Amino acid sequence: EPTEKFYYIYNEKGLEVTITARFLYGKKVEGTAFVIFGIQDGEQRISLPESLKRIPIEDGSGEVVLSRKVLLDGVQNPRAEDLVGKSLYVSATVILHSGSDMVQAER
Amino acid sequence: NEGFTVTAEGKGQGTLSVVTMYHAKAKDQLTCNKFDLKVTIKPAPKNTMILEICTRYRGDQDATMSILDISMMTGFAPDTDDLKQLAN
């Protein structure tokens, strides 16, 4: 659940993503998470290798930030206005400390 | 799976096709696809042994983030200090 359902183009703070993982039966979870930010332009999906961040999830909560520099440099074009009209997606993978299984949740 | 006879009559043309779904034997299947792994276990020089992992990637470029899940034998524990050096 991102804090805002958008990304301001001039926001120097950058996109912020909050991971909230919980067990099905109402108990909190502990483990580690994987986040990768991809830019979706219609049917064309472009990935950002340098945005891969290994964040530890504590009490079913965690955060990760994409600095605007990474978004600008990931695409070859350094222009800003061209990015208007596109979309981003988050492909989060959560893994237990036990290593039982992992779930790929994508927004 | 058996042979059958086709009988057609009347005006018009139609497309008749037969597709058979079967489970075929694999050829040169690699259970360790894209990941060549080599575990070497040796006795140490309380009972303890030195455990070694040698890993490699089959791709052209260096692989992305990888995970080494380890589930040791019954009644075994990792050495604390070794994990301390491996952590930092």
How does A15-49 read in b/e, with b if 16+ C-beta sit within 10 Å?
bebebebeeeeeeebebbbbbbbbbeeeeeeeebe
Q: Give the whole-angstrom CA distance, residue B21 versus residue A91.
A: 35
Q: Give the whole-angstrom CA distance, residue A20 versus residue A14.
A: 20
B62 touches chain A (CB under 8 A): no
Interchain proximity A54–B65, CB inside 8 Å = yes
Which spans in chain B are helix H? 80-87
Task: Tokens for A9, please give them.
Answer: 């183009």
Contacts of A54 in chain B (CB under 8 A): 65
Q: What are phi and psi of A68, to 5 degrees?
A: -60, -30
Interchain proximity B65–A95, CB inside 8 Å = no
Q: Environment class of residue A92 by beta-carbon count within 10 Å: exposed (0-12), middle (13-18) or buried (19+)?
A: buried
**β-pair type (A37-41, A87-96):** antiparallel
Interchain proximity A95–B67, CB inside 8 Å = yes
The residue whose two tokens read 């993978």 is A93
Give yes or no for a contact between A62 and A92, defined as CB atoms under 8 angstroms apart. Answer: no
Which one of B67, B68, B70 makes the best mutation probe of the A interface by having the most chain A beta carbons within 10 Å? B67
Q: How many beta-carbon pairs under 8 angstroms link A with B?
A: 8
Q: Give the whole-angstrom CA distance, residue B7 versus residue B1.
A: 19
What number of CA atoms fall less than 13 Å from residue A56's CA on the CB side?
3
CA angle B39, B42, B44 (to 5 degrees): 140
Give yes or no for a contact between A95 and B69, defined as CB atoms under 8 angstroms apart. Answer: no
The residue whose two tokens read 């958008």 is A6
B19 touches chain A (CB under 8 A): no
Residue boundaries of the structural domains of chain A: 1-107
B64 touches chain A (CB under 8 A): yes
- Technique behind the model: cryo-EM
Instruction: Look at domain A1-107 and name its CATH class.
Output: mainly beta
Q: How many CB atoms lie within 10 A of CB A91?
A: 14
Contacts of B62 in chain A (CB under 8 A): none
The residue whose two tokens read 């988050």 is A90
**Which helix (H) or strand (E) is A39 found in, with range?**
strand A37-41
Q: Environment class of residue A14 by beta-carbon count within 10 Å: exposed (0-12), middle (13-18) or buried (19+)?
A: middle
Give yes or no for a contact between B58 and B30, defined as CB atoms under 8 angstroms apart. Answer: no
Q: Give the whole-angstrom CA distance, residue A39 versus residue A90.
A: 9
- Contacts of A101 by beta carbon, 8 Å cutoff, 6+ apart: none
C-alpha distances (whole Å) from A51 to each of A78, B65, B71 are 17, 12, 30
Q: Give the whole-angstrom CA distance, residue A75 versus residue A48.
A: 8
